[PDB]
Ligand binder design. Structure first.
Ligand SMILES: [Cu+]
Ligand SMILES: [Cu+]
Lengths: 122, 127
């Protein structure tokens, strides 16, 4: 598999894949006899794990540590669980912040005859 | 008011104020005898609206349009529409975050959370 196929399969863009390699977050790709990057299922799983971990909120470092745990046959599921529960609490806080913004925008809108919205924001 | 007074009052850095002016997001201030930007209460209102708008969800372009509506003598409905569209955007964001949280908590409950390598969180977050 070349990087194009990997992008199509993982949904990640070529830039992101290269970015993760540059950051040393994934097992480096191999080079073909021609000098071009080739990958294996191992790279796909690692990249897939990275794409999904980012989607849920883990920063770059956290996501990479998740890749390390994935590659470690002697991993402790307790460590993955602890990191996940910590991530959940963060998402709860993020949810609360958005609900606060939503509450404010709705209070303004309901006060608007359709302007209390612009006068109060300004 | 000079740019520094405006930075203090609005809580924006003088660099940010210059930026908003440069992107034509706010009215260009006039110039004093010595060539310095002089701001009026109007500039304070635009900058504040721009800061508040962003803080509550609108992106730069959207906030700039809000400033346009602000200075317009005439749009109660056009603003209420934008506002209600932003909330729908936030509720969707909220919905997505709730779904991710639920997914992670489902996997966590399935996780042995012990010293064994078998981990459904890792296994399902990967391939
Ligand atoms: Cu309104
Ligand atoms: Cu686990």
């Amino acid at each position: 598999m070349n990087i194009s196929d990997v992008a199509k399969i993982t949904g990640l863009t070529s830039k992101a894949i290269r970015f993760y390699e540059e950051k040393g977050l994934v097992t480096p790709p191999m080079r073909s006899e021609n000098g071009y990057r080739t990958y294996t299922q191992q790279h796909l799983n690692e990249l897939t794990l990275l794409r999904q971990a980012r989607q849920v909120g883990f920063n770059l470092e956290e996501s990479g540590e998740l890749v390390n745990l994935f590659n470690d046959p002697q991993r402790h599921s307790a460590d993955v669980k602890r990191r996940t529960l910590e991530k959940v609490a963060e998402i709860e806080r993020h949810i609360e912040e958005l609900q606060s913004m939503r509450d404010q925008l709705l209070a303004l809108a309901n006060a608007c005859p359709g302007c209390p919205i612009i006068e109060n924001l300004s």
